Design a protein around this nucleic acid. Sequence first.
RNA 1: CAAGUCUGGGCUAAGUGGUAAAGGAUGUGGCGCCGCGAAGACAGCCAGGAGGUUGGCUUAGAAGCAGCCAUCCUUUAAAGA
Lengths: 274, 37, 139, 141
Amino acid sequence: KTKADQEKLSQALARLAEEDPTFRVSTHPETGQTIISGMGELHLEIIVDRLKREFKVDANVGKPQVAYRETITKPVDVEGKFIRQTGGRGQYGHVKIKVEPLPRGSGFEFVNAIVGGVIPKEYIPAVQKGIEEAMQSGPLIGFPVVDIKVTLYDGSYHEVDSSEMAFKIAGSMAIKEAVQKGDPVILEPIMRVEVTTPEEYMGDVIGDLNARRGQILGMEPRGNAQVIRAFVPLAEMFGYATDLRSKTQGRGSFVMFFDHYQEVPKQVQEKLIK
Amino acid sequence: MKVRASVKRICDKCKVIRRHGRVYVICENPKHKQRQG
Amino acid sequence: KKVVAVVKLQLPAGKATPAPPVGPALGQHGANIMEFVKAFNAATANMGDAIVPVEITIYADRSFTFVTKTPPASYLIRKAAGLEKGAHKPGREKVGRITWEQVLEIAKQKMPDLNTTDLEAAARMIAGSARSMGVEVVG
Amino acid sequence: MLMPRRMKYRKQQRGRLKGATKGGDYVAFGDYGLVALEPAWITAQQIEAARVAMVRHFRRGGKIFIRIFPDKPYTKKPLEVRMGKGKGNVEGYVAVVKPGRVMFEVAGVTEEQAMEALRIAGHKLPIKTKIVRRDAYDEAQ
RNA sequence: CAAGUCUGGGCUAAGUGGUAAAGGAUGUGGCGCCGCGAAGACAGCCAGGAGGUUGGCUUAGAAGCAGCCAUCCUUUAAAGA
């Protein structure tokens, strides 16, 4: 809750983490919020009493967030101009680039596409720190615009006006628009899961998984059990413990691993614009 | 599909009954149990 | 001490590992799950691939048994046309073919399984399986 | 939607809907048809709404023939305004339909499919309708 | 409340009559045309209801039974890819 209680909580674990190492407290290193590792609904639940009562902290209990990503569909190419000739530090930076989407899981790639050198040598690092920068806050919501290849294939400059910095903008302008133009697309996190389950409960097991935006990959049996592998979205994945152990009266266990990122079904496009 | 103004046959197992000046329509799936009104 | 059987598995050629459906269903068999990848791949060392149906039957003394049929009628027919897949849409699209004789040669391959005891009939079951995968019969 | 592109007069008088049809009471094109049983005013939307659902119903179908054509401006004074002051502005358009008039008709499609599509069209319309085949529609030149 | 609880034939079973629409319905009468007809029909009982073949494509998997096509053969008294 208000930063006030942020403290009562600190001590909360500072003593509760000695009095029970069967959990783990983690501050999401990308976005404040802290995760509370538990070992079952009830578990986290009963901590919610003690930690909220015998410690009288009264905070929030919703769910983890999802590491989205931004990017684009169609490749574009725009002008990146900047120039400000008034009288001196002219501030003069201007480039044109080549933006092209890359396969979901391609990475980050620039292209020093300049002929003889209409774009000076010494100014590129900064033209990139510019582009690289701007990829931070997505065009859609604000998240790491990824999976693209950038090509610097022109750009002039000024003898006295340009600056290392002036390019960092120009370049951070050409990028701040290529993305806006090439129709953004909300990528999202997919996981790898494997429920260990007696093909008894299976039946619904897979169903359940299907009606979770997820799509199966297989089930090569084991012992009296049978394993099921497949991908799912972290959003439509929550609180799976007391969902699996449900459809299995307890004889059910799973794992989870990250894998790739992937576009949202448009229905989920305008959903996220909230 | 209980009460309505357009009662029809929602699957082969359904039957258009009419006990009591009231056209009922019954089937094996208690969902199709209708009745005009 | 499990119950009895006329198990109707369907194991391909070669892949004979105790792993299911050869474990759950031959877990009430006592089935020497390894006296197959030798007694099988011995007879079907000939063929190579193609699935081979099998009926492993258990008893009470906890022993097994099993007889195997022929490889799919659709098998011999893919290799006899440079085919692999059917033709996605049978009929309109021919991708390869078999003559009046090549079909009458395969009915020979699977004649001790079907039902009729000719070829004028047997062959028809293959010429039928022709358009089942869009493989017109040459004549 | 559909409508005149030009017009001598932006507005025209009411008039009244009588029996007969004057014409288009026969097939002549496709294979099956839909005809007006009561006289009325079909709005474009009314039409449109069907013609959509018409097509919708039968993915990859034939050709759909709209044999009618709206061309009577629909008038309407604004809301909360008294009488006089001239006439009323246009609202939309409508086609004066009369019974025996072949409204739409499909061509190339299984009867099972024609008998269906047409049926549904009838639902987006205000008036009761009949589906006619093609027997004696032979010669009406 | 004056003059037929008049006569012959038909319908209606809700008091419809005794004021409402699209749209629904094995309502109840009445005409029609057109098939099967005792070498056994309708309901009907017990029967058999198969083998190629899990058709081919597709799919995680489709085996008659998601969905595309395709719909031939078979042993028959008959059994649909």
